[PDB]
Amino acid sequence: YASLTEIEHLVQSVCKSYRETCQLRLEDLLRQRSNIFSREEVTGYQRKSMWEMWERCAHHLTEAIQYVVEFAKRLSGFMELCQNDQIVLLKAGAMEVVLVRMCRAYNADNRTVFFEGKYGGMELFRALGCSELISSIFDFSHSLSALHFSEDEIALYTALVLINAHRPGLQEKRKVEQLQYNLELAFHHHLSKTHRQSILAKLPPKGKLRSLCSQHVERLQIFQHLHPIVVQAAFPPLYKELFST
Amino acid sequence: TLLQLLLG
Ligand SMILES: C/C(=C\CC[C@@H](C)[C@H]1CC[C@@]2(C)C3=C(CC[C@]12C)[C@@]1(C)CCC(=O)C(C)(C)[C@@H]1CC3=O)CO
Numbered sequence A: 001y002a003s004l005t006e007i008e009h010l011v012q013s014v015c016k017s018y019r020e021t022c023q024l025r026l027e028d029l030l031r032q033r034s035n036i037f038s039r040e041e042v043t044g045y046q047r048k049s050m051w052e053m054w055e056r057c058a059h060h061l062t063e064a065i066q067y068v069v070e071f072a073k074r075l076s077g078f079m080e081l082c083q084n085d086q087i088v089l090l091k092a093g094a095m096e097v098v099l100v101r102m103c104r105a106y107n108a109d110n111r112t113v114f115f116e117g118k119y120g121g122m123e124l125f126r127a128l129g130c131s132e133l134i135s136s137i138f139d140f141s142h143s144l145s146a147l148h149f150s151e152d153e154i155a156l157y158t159a160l161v162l163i164n165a166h167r168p169g170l171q172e173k174r175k176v177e178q179l180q181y182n183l184e185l186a187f188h189h190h191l192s193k194t195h196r197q198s199i200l201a202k203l204p205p206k207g208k209l210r211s212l213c214s215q216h217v218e219r220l221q222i223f224q225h226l227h228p229i230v231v232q233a234a235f236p237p238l239y240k241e242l243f244s245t
Numbered sequence B: 001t002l003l004q005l006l007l008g
Helices: A004-021 A026-034 A039-046 A050-074 A083-105 A122-128 A131-145 A151-162 A173-193 A197-202 A206-226 A228-234 A237-243 B002-007
Strands: A112-115 A118-120
Touching: A004 A050, A004 A151, A004 A173, A026 A083, A026 A118, A039 A118, A039 A122, A050 A083, A050 A122, A050 A151, A050 A206, A050 A228, A050 A237, A050 B002, A083 A112, A083 A131, A083 A151, A083 A173, A083 A206, A083 A237, A083 B002, A122 A131, A131 A206, A151 A173, A173 A197, A206 A228, A206 A237, A237 B002
Parallel strands: none
Antiparallel strands: A112 A118
């Protein structure tokens, strides 16, 4: 039965944790909006081998996930859960969190994402050979851009993306349920205080993030079966652990 | 696991 002061202290703790682990400051991403890949640079990316483009993207994704791991480490209540449950939650939620975080680096006006120093369209990623997945991820970021999340809202929402008591394999489900509820109280309190409860009905359907993650695992299966040695030799060990079957 | 290591 967390008190109002405890709920308020949770809001602050979650928001602080996100600030410390956000990977790139929002202002930096916004400042870079006019730095867009040229037609020649786009073509250069498109003409990369499938293996090199997958390898680059796997490294960048691993980097982004490492920040999400640090977010969880600092998240009030997460370290209180048993070791098994920490693992279950991060293994399922890490990628979901990255997909939400991406909207900050997404410019809806020209439908570009910040990638390797400049903004580029989904055409940048053609060499991967998973255009449907990329389009679905860009559609997802475009949908989130319409919500106009503040930094604090992203912090509170990504905490809830991670603390999801519906994941199978939890040893202490009721403990996770209790933390989830308190984080829900923290989110809703912050939203009520800022007149932003209207966003709740517009948040992605919960099956959405799961679906994007399954699609990503499936596209890696297609790539890995075609280039198994490249993945074994060159891909980050954390990436394989999280995503390979 | 690696997640275990990264978490301590
Ligand atoms: C095939 C595979 C993946 C699908 C391809 C894309 C969907 C994916 C490749 C690069 C990546 C990982 C990426 C980000 C989120 C997704 C993308 C663009 C964000 C935008 C997230 C957080 C940030 O603010 C920065 C730090 C700006 C990064 C930059 C960044 O390199 C790999 O399995």
